[model samples]
Target: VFHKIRNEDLIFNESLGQGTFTKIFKGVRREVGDYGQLHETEVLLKVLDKAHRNYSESFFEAASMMSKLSHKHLVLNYGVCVCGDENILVQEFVKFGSLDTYLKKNKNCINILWKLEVAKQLAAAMHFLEENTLIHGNVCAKNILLIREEDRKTGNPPFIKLSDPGISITVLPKDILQERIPWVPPECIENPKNLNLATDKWSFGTTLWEICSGGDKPLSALDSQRKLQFYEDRHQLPAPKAAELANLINNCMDYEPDHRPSFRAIIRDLNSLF
Candidate 1:
């Protein structure tokens, strides 16, 4: 059963970030009576945009479906709430912010091994989704959250978690899609509703490019969406410093979706690197 959080019980701390149709807040559960030990639990609350209440039902359905999925590399959704016309989703609070922000701040300091680990963990998560016949729909550096390992004091590797899976295009604004054109596959651009496993693989390759290039745009040198489209149409992709990883990214970004390796295959290749 999903927990119901009252507006008064939610103590909003700070803005996590803004999404296409929601504003994320980092907050704490202030009530103790109903949840017992869950009191004072830190959580990330996603508040749907009031302007988009017409699509609240769609958001509720998507969030509900996401809550049922559980995986170590996927964010944990606690529950959802409906107050008046507002819809809120509560999920575990990841200490560090998104991989996008983290990589931008630590670009010079992040080592190759750390980047490889990030790719491996994400591939594992994607493999999990593929096994369940689920499409992530959106996969990018910004959707990847980072958390310090429990043994951080003793130097354990950083733990990464994927968030915002299975969000439908109906809820996404056009501007957001325009900004994300670089990560989107060519076919999905032609038909927004055509997202599937292959499109997700294309996104995974772009995300890996971001991770390897320390948050650089997958095709930073390209100036316009048309140019990026033309480049992809010609089967061109940004080259990575590592030869083996370059091959993997090329395979994932293949023009023919059938040529792309499955997430399981990607994970297997990543594991072999370590």
Candidate 2:
């Protein structure tokens, strides 16, 4: 179940972003802990105008879907706040930014082990999806957030959190209108109405390429699916120096969806690699 946080319970900081429907802000939520003490949670708040009709329909759809998810790798959803005349969505603020940005900026310093760590953690997320029955249609690097930083010399591994589940069919058009990251399997591109575990597997595999290749993005000018597939002869895909890692990626991106290993199998192989 989700919470209904009041406006008084949240203290807003600076505005992080703005849109016609949502004004995102950095905020803190104060609540009572089980021990009868006060607790504070740092969060990202998406406050939407209730007057917008599509905002009510699509925004609530996203909130409901996020409410049903539970996993450490999944970005935490605190709940929706019916504060003031607007409905605000409360979620964990991932300070480290998206995986795409992190890989591009820190490509020079991160090692193979670091790359493997990212793969393993991400596979763990997909494994959770398999059991939970949540089909994460978008598994691209841009949708994955590096929630916590890493220090291989003396500390914990980086915490990678998955966000923007692509769960709300009602909210789909807005995303298409704004930005569409090009990293889809060929079959899915041919058939827009289809998305399942296999499509996600291909997307996940490409994200692994993102890690190894230091987050190089897809060619923007390829307007057609044939042109897009022109780069997909496997030569263009980035491969780490480690041969096994490369092979695992190939397995994930198999042409036949049925041939692709389940997320659990991916996790098992990833664990053995450690």
The alpha-carbon RMSD values of the candidates against the true structure, listed in the order shown, are 2.7, 3.8
How do the residues 171-250 of candidate 2 rate in per-residue lDDT, one tens digit apiece? 45533422343456655644546667677788788788777777676544555554445535533444655455787778
TM-score, prediction 2 = 0.79
Q: What would the per-residue lDDT of candidate 1 be over residues 1-274, giving only the tens digit for each residue?
A: 5778787777788998888678999989765556465567899988878887777776666666556688898888877754666778888899988999898888888887888888888998888888888877788999899976325477677889998753466356655565676677777666677777888898898888888877777655655666555645676665866545887888898877788899988988888874
Error of 2 at 127 (Å): 1.0
lDDT against the true structure, each candidate: 0.77, 0.72
The Cα error of candidate 2 at residue 231, in Å, is 8.8
Highest lDDT among the candidates is held by which one?
1
Instruction: Write out the backbone clash pairs for model 2.
Output: none
In model 1, the worst 10-residue window by lDDT is 165-174
